[PDB]
Amino acid sequence: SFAKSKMLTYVDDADHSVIGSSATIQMVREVQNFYKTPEAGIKYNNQIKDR
């Protein structure tokens, strides 16, 4: 699993003073063969928000 706060401790450790950081994450699964989808699929967990 990818944790936002667990990466933000490494980006915080880059150089002496970064005085912390924030981010917003977009989940993206690129899928070849558009126009169809595999009759079941493009399933990325961790239910996304509306629209």
Add this chain to the structure above:
Amino acid sequence: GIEASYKFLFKVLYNEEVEIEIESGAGTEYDIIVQSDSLTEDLVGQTIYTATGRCNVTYIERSYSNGKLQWTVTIHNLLGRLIAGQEVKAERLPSFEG
């Protein structure tokens, strides 16, 4: 259990004779490019048949040419000589027309 163990078995015990066996197995692969919509993946593993011939699908990688959509499917264990212009419907998920 692996192929070529049979060939070792029948030497040792049942007669001395050679053996040859074919399932939808491992084997040489061929290149075939097909154009359709609806070809969305997971067809790998299915059995494609045309009017002329029948076959299975190892690898679904897409090709690039303008117009329609054209995938180059890696095919193995082919029998029956599929030829250009065939309508190539898959056995299941039927929805494959191409």
Add this chain to the structure above:
Amino acid sequence: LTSEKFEVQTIELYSDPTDDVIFTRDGSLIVFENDLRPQYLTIDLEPISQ
């Protein structure tokens, strides 16, 4: 609508999760490796002083 009427290099499908832990199951990965896809960072510096 038939194909070839589009262009469509591949696709993306961006999405915004409700949770920030964003697990993975079945077949999947995470795969940052920006070198092949530097459309994801856009990391931004905000200089300050005091």
